[PDB]
Amino acid sequence: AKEKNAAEIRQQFAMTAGSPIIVNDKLERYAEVRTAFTHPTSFFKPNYKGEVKPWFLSAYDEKVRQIENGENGPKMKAKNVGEARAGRALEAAGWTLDINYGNIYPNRFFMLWSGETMTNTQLWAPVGLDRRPPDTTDPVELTNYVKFAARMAGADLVGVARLNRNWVYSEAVTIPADVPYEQSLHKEIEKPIVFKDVPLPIETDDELIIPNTCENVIVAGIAMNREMMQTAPNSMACATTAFCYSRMCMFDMWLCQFIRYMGYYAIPSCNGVGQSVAFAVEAGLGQASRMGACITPEFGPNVRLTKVFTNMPLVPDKPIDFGVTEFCETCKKCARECPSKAITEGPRTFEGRSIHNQSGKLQWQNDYNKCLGYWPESGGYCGVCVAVCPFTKGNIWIHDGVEWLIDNTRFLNITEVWDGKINTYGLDADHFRDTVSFRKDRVK
Amino acid sequence: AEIRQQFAMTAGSPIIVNDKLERYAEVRTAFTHPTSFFKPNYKGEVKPWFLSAYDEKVRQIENGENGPKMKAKNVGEARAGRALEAAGWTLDINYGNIYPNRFFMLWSGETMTNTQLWAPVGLDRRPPDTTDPVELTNYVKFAARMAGADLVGVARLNRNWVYSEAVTIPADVPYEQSLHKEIEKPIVFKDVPLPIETDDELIIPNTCENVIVAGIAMNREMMQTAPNSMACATTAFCYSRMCMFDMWLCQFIRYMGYYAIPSCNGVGQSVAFAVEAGLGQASRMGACITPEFGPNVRLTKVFTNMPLVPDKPIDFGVTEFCETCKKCARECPSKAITEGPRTFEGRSIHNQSGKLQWQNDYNKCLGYWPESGGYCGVCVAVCPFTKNITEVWDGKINTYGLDADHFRDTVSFRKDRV
Ligand SMILES: Oc1ccc(Br)cc1
Ligand SMILES: Oc1ccc(Br)cc1
Ligand SMILES: Oc1ccc(Br)cc1
Ligand SMILES: Oc1ccc(Br)cc1
Ligand code: SF4
Ligand code: SF4
Ligand code: SF4
Ligand code: SF4
Numbered sequence: 001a002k003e004k005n006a007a008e009i010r011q012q013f014a015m016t017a018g019s020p021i022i023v024n025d026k027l028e029r030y031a032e033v034r035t036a037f038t039h040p041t042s043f044f045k046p047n048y049k050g051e052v053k054p055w056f057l058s059a060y061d062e063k064v065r066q067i068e069n070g071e072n073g074p075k076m077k078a079k080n081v082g083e084a085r086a087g088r089a090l091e092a093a094g095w096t097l098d099i100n101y102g103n104i105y106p107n108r109f110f111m112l113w114s115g116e117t118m119t120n121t122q123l124w125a126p127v128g129l130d131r132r133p134p135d136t137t138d139p140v141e142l143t144n145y146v147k148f149a150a151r152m153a154g155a156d157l158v159g160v161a162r163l164n165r166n167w168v169y170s171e172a173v174t175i176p177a178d179v180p181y182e183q184s185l186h187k188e189i190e191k192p193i194v195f196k197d198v199p200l201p202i203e204t205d206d207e208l209i210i211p212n213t214c215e216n217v218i219v220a221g222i223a224m225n226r227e228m229m230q231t232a233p234n235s236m237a238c239a240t241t242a243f244c245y246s247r248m249c250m251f252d253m254w255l256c257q258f259i260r261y262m263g264y265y266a267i268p269s270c271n272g273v274g275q276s277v278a279f280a281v282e283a284g285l286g287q288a289s290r291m292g293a294c295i296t297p298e299f300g301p302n303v304r305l306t307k308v309f310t311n312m313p314l315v316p317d318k319p320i321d322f323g324v325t326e327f328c329e330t331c332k333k334c335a336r337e338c339p340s341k342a343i344t345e346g347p348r349t350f351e352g353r354s355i356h357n358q359s360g361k362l363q364w365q366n367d368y369n370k371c372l373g374y375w376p377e378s379g380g381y382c383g384v385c386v387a388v389c390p391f392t393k394g395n396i397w398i399h400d401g402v403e404w405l406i407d408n409t410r411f412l413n414i415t416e417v418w419d420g421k422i423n424t425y426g427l428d429a430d431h432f433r434d435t436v437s438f439r440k441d442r443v444k
Numbered sequence: 445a446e447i448r449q450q451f452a453m454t455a456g457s458p459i460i461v462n463d464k465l466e467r468y469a470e471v472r473t474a475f476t477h478p479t480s481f482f483k484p485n486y487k488g489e490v491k492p493w494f495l496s497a498y499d500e501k502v503r504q505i506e507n508g509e510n511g512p513k514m515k516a517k518n519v520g521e522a523r524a525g526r527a528l529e530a531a532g533w534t535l536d537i538n539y540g541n542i543y544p545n546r547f548f549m550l551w552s553g554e555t556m557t558n559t560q561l562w563a564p565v566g567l568d569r570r571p572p573d574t575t576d577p578v579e580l581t582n583y584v585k586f587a588a589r590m591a592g593a594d595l596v597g598v599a600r601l602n603r604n605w606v607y608s609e610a611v612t613i614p615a616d617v618p619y620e621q622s623l624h625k626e627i628e629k630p631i632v633f634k635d636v637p638l639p640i641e642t643d644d645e646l647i648i649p650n651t652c653e654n655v656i657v658a659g660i661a662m663n664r665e666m667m668q669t670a671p672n673s674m675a676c677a678t679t680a681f682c683y684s685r686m687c688m689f690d691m692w693l694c695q696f697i698r699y700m701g702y703y704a705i706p707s708c709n710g711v712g713q714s715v716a717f718a719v720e721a722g723l724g725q726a727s728r729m730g731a732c733i734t735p736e737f738g739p740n741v742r743l744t745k746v747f748t749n750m751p752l753v754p755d756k757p758i759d760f761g762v763t764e765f766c767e768t769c770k771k772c773a774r775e776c777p778s779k780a781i782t783e784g785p786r787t788f789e790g791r792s793i794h795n796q797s798g799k800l801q802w803q804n805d806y807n808k809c810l811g812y813w814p815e816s817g818g819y820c821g822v823c824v825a826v827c828p829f830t831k832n833i834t835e836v837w838d839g840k841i842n843t844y845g846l847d848a849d850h851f852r853d854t855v856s857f858r859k860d861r862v
Contacts, residue, residue: 060564067573082574086583089567089699090590096558096695097688109557119547119619120534126498129527135505136520144837145524149531151841152663152681181557223843225590243590243692250688253534254681261527418582419858422589424661427843429852436848439838 027360073234094242300391465798532680738829
């Protein structure tokens with residue numbers, strides 16, 4: 001006659017301890033300014049009138065053009081102008097709790113490295129939870145507590161790894177502390193991230209200082225909505241992306257406060273501080289893939305990541321190998337469907353394709369300037385590679401009577417989305433049992 | 445979805461009122477009123493009630509307890525429950541976000557970082573492209589589910605449930621002085637284009653036709669630990685879910701060409717709005733009891749001129765069940781809940797007289813919070829419609845504390861949205 005079981009799947013494919021990422025001697029920490037979103041070589045893109053602008057402003061011009069022409073995406077006619085409008089209103093509102101598309105500035109706005117000034121900390125100050133020494137130092141108990149809190153805080157997946165500094169940005173993109181929001185985009189700077197023998201995360205005029213005791217990284221997966229992502233590259237894919245960034249932000253703040261009130265310190269990050277995919281792989285959420293994302297058993301790549309760094313003692317999780325690398329070796333669906341041909345069809349190498357790649361680690365090397373170039377053209381955040389990946393299909397797992405396996409057969413419109421199935425936070429009750437959690441699967 | 449249609453009433457507010465009903469000044473709630481605000485701690489020192497409750501939380505942690513007379517596994521566990529509770533409140537100002545047009549509860553999006561970033565697109569400046577209330581109701585409910593509501597309904601705004609005067613703070617007062625500088629400010633309805641605040645008044649436009657009410661489900665296993673710390677924790681986390689819902693949904697409504705007023709625990713009485721919007725029925729304890737969650741669900745609401753189709757109120761027999769049940773009243777640690785019949789006369793200043801309801805003594809309720817060091821919730825926990833702490837921490841959990849064994853009950857398609 002067997003119903004899907006993520007705990008069994010993860011146990012079946014668990015590896016022995018050790019970072020799965022393969023590196024050589026060319027590896028150096030990566031300056032965040034090099035990402036396509038920020039680097040001068042990629043930052044500017046033409047709009048549909050040929051005017052060269054910051055990429056997100058050129059994308060804005062295309063969003064406005066599509067609404068006026070009753071389109072939900074590039075050459076994709078909406079039911080009417082009102083439907084086109086509704087999709088961009090949903091997208092825009094999803095970003096409500098996110099600063100400048102990613103919350104990357106460390107220790108600014110929502111991403112504070114200390115809780116001292118937050119209104120919640122001030123209200124609770126008489127209890128002294130953030131000043132009382134920890135009552136628990138046992139990593140086993142702390143891992144159970146912090147993972148339970150993580151699920152409360154909106155994570156669909158949570159894992160723990162030792163912090164690998166190779167993936168922490170050599171220098172962050174940030175703004176001076178005295179610069180108000182309305183000037184932030186004009187006053188962005190770089191600032192080194194360094195590790196020193198200090199008791200608490202602290203920021204000087206010159207440096208963002210992470211303590212040498214910052215042992216661990218907690219990684220969260222924030223599930224996006226399948227029906228909406230499958231509209232990629234059209235507006236509804238932008239909306240599930242946007243809403244999950246605000247979920248990421250709430251997660252980080254909730255969890256950091258929990259960790260602080262347990263007597264440790266905690267650094268939030270969302271898209272800042274370090275490379276989420278690498279942390280997620282080392283924390284066992286999933287495997288790296290040809291497109292470059294972390295592919296998870298539960299959601300494929302259709303899941304966002306955030307992470308929190310802490311000195312709280314924790315038990316690292318085991319990495320997972322459910323065969324993604326070998327599937328990506330033969331699949332190439334994302335490479336073939338990518339509207340900008342940004343994804344390589346070749347083998348993995350240690351050699352960066354351009355400045356946006358960190359050389360010295362074995363991965364599929366993609367041209368992320370080509371990817372970013374398609375966003376102003378399509379007026380969105382694309383996501384076609386996520387949408388076409390077979391691992392994004394909700395039912396890829398089958399049980400053969402003995403064990404779990406991937407179904408190889410899987411590798412061979414917006415009005416209906418607005419009118420169709422939805423549930424709280426865009427989660428799907430047909431799959432929400434995938435992420436049920438008991439102590440047995442939080443810590444062994 | 446068929447249960448709720450099975451029990452739909454015809455249109456019309458189910459709340460029975462008389463000639464004496466008047467709008468209720470928010471200062472009168474037990475949380476804020478000077479007759480109920482100060483309570484002794486366990487040492488006998490009289491303080492603001494939440495400060496006396498803090499002292500009990502400290503004392504329990506030190507004594508390795510999760511609640512009154514309830515030993516924890518160890519001090520570490522006691523600490524963890526209070527750390528979780530305190531963290532849950534991260535996105536909430538001074539227990540409830542009640543000050544209108546302050547902090548998270550802004551009546552205009554114009555100064556929000558999100559609005560500024562999106563300004564070149566001009567979605568908040570562009571006239572509505574959709575005025576059909578049917579399509580708007582489908583769009584905004586879909587948005588509401590994305591925004592974290594497990595239940596959503598629409599009603600015409602009954603001004604009887606809007607506070608006559610809000611509790612707020614002067615606009616330039618910093619957060620650190622807020623608790624000490626709370627003031628009263630009238631909420632009035634005038635012929636103005638947009639919601640606006642003057643030195644003297646919070647002005648809601650006469651065009652503000654509708655209220656959208658959201659139900660935000662709490663975790664059943666955690667609330668079952670009431671009056672102990674883990675029921676405090678699911679309470680707290682849902683207040684921050686409430687705040688994110690309000691901001692997300694207001695931004696959606698504004699980017700659609702309308703205005704939107706958030707509220708969380710402020711602006712007006714959530715239980716009344718929820719009953720008129722069809723989420724559930726009023727109950728003996730005073731809460732809105734829903735078919736999906738019983739009373740184990742928090743409420744928030746957003747006010748807007750967006751054309752919408754009002755939902756029908758529902759009758760699935762709560763009133764007749766509450767007549768004979770009285771379990772909440774017998775389990776209530778403070779004897780706050782009446783065993784008697786419904787009347788139009790409030791028992792004290794904390795009740796709004798003029799509406800038929802079970803009249804409860806809410807000062808007796810609040811008095812149990814400093815004694816127990818939490819937000820109680822025993823009434824919610826024992827209610828039949830709702831159906832140790834180490835086992836909760838070691839037991840089932842899922843995203844936002846939702847439960848996959850019941851999450852299918854809140855699936856939604858267009859047919860059940862409008
Ligand atoms: O991950 C993302 C970052 C920025 C934008 Br805009 C969209 C997606
Ligand atoms: O007087 C006080 C009021 C509130 C807090 Br919190 C601390 C002190
Ligand atoms: O509704 C609530 C208001 C204040 C507290 Br403290 C807890 C719950
Ligand atoms: O020059 C700018 C105009 C609008 C934005 Br948003 C950012 C920069
Ligand atoms: S589409 Fe195919 S090659 Fe691309 S990431 Fe998914 S499985 Fe790998
Ligand atoms: S987001 Fe789009 S353009 Fe970018 S890699 Fe994926 S498919 Fe290609
Ligand atoms: S919260 Fe507790 S004290 Fe208050 S009415 Fe309910 S049972 Fe009684
Ligand atoms: S416990 Fe009984 S009387 Fe009290 S609200 Fe629930 S059903 Fe009604």
